[PDB]
Design a protein around this ligand. Sequence first.
Ligand SMILES: [Cu+2]
Lengths: 37, 37, 37, 37
Amino acid sequence: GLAAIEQKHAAIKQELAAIKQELAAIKQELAAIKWEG
Amino acid sequence: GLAAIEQKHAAIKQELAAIKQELAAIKQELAAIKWEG
Amino acid sequence: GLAAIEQKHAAIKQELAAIKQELAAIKQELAAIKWEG
Amino acid sequence: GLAAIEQKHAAIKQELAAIKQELAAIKQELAAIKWEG
Ligand SMILES: [Cu+2]
């Protein structure tokens, strides 16, 4: 019921936060590559 | 339940938007790398 | 309710599929940058 | 309940996993760029 839905929504949100963090890291790495190259 | 199916998905909506912004930022860096050849 | 849940889940899926597609485009652009250097 | 909600969020789980795979792929390209300087 609600509780199972709430768990899945929480798991989704966590995975999305992880994706955003990984993207922010990739962006910073590209800024580094831009300056060295 | 209605709250969760809209708000909670509310959290998911906001993380999706954050990811889309990061993707736009990454594309900006790639364009700048490609510009400098 | 049911079709409305299906609405938000379809909207999420579509945004996720768009994110995945832009990432696969980003991977290709990086692979080219790699093969240039 | 905790039966119908599964297939409900299955498409999203699969997209998340596909996104995570593309992130891994992007990081592979970034590591190879960094390797060659
Ligand atoms: Cu949901």
